[PDB]
Structure 1
């Protein structure tokens, strides 16, 4: 069986859990709880993923896969249902780019979170935090203007990644209030939030 380094707050981990849920592969995966930060290492995790990040997936043979996008690609090839990542065609690079946009939202939102929650407030850099927040808002603007129809057509790699990014914004950055300027995205997000895979993977209250 597989072992996934796991935390119920992480949206990168959540992408993997949603994909396992959608593809019916949860029964293959043991979760290994992990609490960590860049300034608070998890030594057991570090022995499997030297970068000290989750998710990391340990295979039946002991080999370890990371990061999330590599794990997602692996798991999508493990089941015989319709692939959640297009194998070829323009759809492949379109959906993978949308997923990368979602990852970029998570990257920025995690950097802001670490800064505001772990770094001494006297050492905060406001132009930095604002720079990160700007990436998030530019990204959301694009999804709203260019991606609504594509996201709706299939709950795949792109939809899962965006959905998880949005959930993390609600969870750790509710001050952004992303729904105001992005109604179509918000409406879609409420709808997919009702999927069993999303309900089952919400971050802790």
Structure 2
């Protein structure tokens, strides 16, 4: 079968796992436990990475999601053409950017020695997250609710990661519509099954 190089904490892996659940493809993929190397190091250790039967490996998560969305016969979760394609992919990119910034803040606080922390840098990354959440609340609520697709899955996983690694960034208070949407989609079997450990 397909082998997915996997880690249960990664929000980028989670996107893939949620799509697999949602599209009924989970039983087609074997999860290979894979080691994180955030400080210093599937020869490139890409996570997620998807190995096909010829030994060739696909990455990163966006490429893997694109591939997997074409292997099932249900409604596509990534629009194949038209304005909706780039709108949903931009919303997904917005979510990926929330993840990128969240991961940078996490790696700094969890892995860099305190003496080497840079507050202006950390605040700059926090600001990206705040600005992105504001856009979602102001512009994207109806859009997210319309279809649990590439955009909704990516945002959901970004929000899950914020709760997981950054509980002290309270985001529900200033984004109540996003909070209500998230509470609901959090109960989907795909989301329940893919929560990060501890």
Per the normalisation by structure 2, the TM-score is 0.97
Deviates most, 160-169 or 57-66: 57-66
Distance 1:128 1:50, change over 3 A: farther
The Cα shift of 1:36 comes to: 1.1
Deviation sequence 1:138-172 (CA, Å, 0-9, x none):
00000000000000000000000000000000000
Gap runs ≥5 in structure 1? 42-48
Give SS of 2:132's match.
Answer: helix
Equivalent-residue separation in structure 1 for 2:43 and 2:85 (angstroms): 30
1:36-75 to structure 2, matched below 5 A, reads 36-41=36-41, 49=42, 51-75=44-68
Q: 2:172 maps to which residue?
A: 179
Equivalent-residue separation in structure 2 for 1:40 and 1:197 (angstroms): 32
Give SS of 2:32's match.
Answer: strand
Equivalent-residue separation in structure 1 for 2:136 and 2:122 (angstroms): 22
Equivalent-residue separation in structure 1 for 2:73 and 2:8 (angstroms): 27
The Cα shift of 1:50 comes to: 5.1
The Cα shift of 1:35 comes to: 2.7
The Cα shift of 1:53 comes to: 3.2
Equivalent-residue separation in structure 2 for 1:57 and 1:195 (angstroms): 24
The Cα shift of 1:130 comes to: 0.5
Equivalent-residue separation in structure 1 for 2:44 and 2:103 (angstroms): 16
Deviation sequence 1:40-89 (CA, Å, 0-9, x none):
42xxxxxxx55533101111111100000000000000111100001111
Equivalent of 2:181, from 179, 188, 195?
188
Give SS of 1:122's match.
Answer: helix
List 4+ stretches of structure 1 deviating above 4 A. none
1:89 partnered with 2:82: yes
1:77 partnered with 2:74: no
The Cα shift of 1:38 comes to: 2.5
Size of the aligned set, in residue pairs, is 198
Give SS of 1:31's match.
Answer: strand
Per the normalisation by structure 1, the TM-score is 0.94
Equivalent of 1:111, from 84, 94, 104?
104
Give SS of 1:145's match.
Answer: helix
